From a paper:
Mutations of human CDC73 are associated with hyperparathyroidism-jaw tumor (HPT-JT) syndrome, which is an autosomal dominant disorder characterized by parathyroid tumors, fibro-osseous jaw tumors, cystic kidney lesions and uterine tumors. PAF1C participates in recruitment of histone modification factors and promotion of transcriptional elongation. To understand how the CDC73 N-terminal domain contributes to CDC73 functions and how CDC73 pathogenic mutations may lead to HPT-JT and other diseases, we have characterized the structural features of the CDC73 N-terminal regions and revealed a previously unidentified N-terminal globular domain. Here, we demonstrate that CDC73-NTD can form a well-folded globular domain, and is conserved from human to yeast.
Based on sequence conservation and the size of trypsin-resistant fragment, we generated new plasmids and purified both hCDC73(1–100) and hCDC73(1–111). First, we determined the crystal structure of CDC73(1–100) using the SAD method (with a soaked platinum derivative) at 1.4 Å resolution, and then the crystal structure of CDC73(1–111) at 1.02 Å resolution. There are one and two molecules in each asymmetric unit for CDC73(1–111) and CDC73(1–100) crystals, respectively. The overall structure of CDC73(1–111) is almost identical with CDC73(1–100), with a r.m.s.d. of Cα positions being 0.894 Å. Both CDC73(1–100) and CDC73(1–111) fold into a globular domain. Analysis using the DALI server shows that CDC73(1–100) has a novel fold. This domain structure is composed of four α helices and one anti-parallel β-sheet consisting of three β-strands. Indeed, our Thermofluor assay showed that hCDC73(1–100) and hCDC73(1–111) have Tm values of 46 °C and 56 °C, respectively.
Residue numbers in the entry: 3 to 100
The structure:
């Protein structure tokens, strides 16, 4: 699963290459909008479909982790990238950083 690959690359600081709409991990590649297996907070409940974070959304959080979460939310809105919702933030960053 691509989120486990992203964890591995992030923890060992191995280069991740973004090229147009593609993300390259070593000699492997995924579309940037590939769905991870991480269900978005609030979805999959009250009869509404599960939705999953895209790889792009997670990379954008990682690249902007220095911001306070509210300012990051504004940056995601401005860049038209889905936000990682606050209830998912600590767990996702914990998983990605080990």
């Amino acid at each position: 699963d691509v989120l486990s690959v992203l964890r591995q690359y992030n923890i060992q600081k191995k280069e991740i290459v973004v090229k147009g709409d593609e993300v390259i991990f070593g000699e492997f590649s995924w579309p940037k909008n590939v769905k991870t297996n991480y269900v978005v907070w609030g979805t999959g409940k009250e009869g509404q479909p599960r939705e999953y974070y895209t790889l792009d959304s997670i990379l954008f959080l990682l690249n902007n982790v220095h911001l306070s979460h509210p300012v990051y939310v504004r940056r995601a809105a401005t860049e038209n990238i889905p936000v990682v919702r606050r209830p998912d933030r600590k767990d996702l960053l914990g998983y990605l950083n080990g």
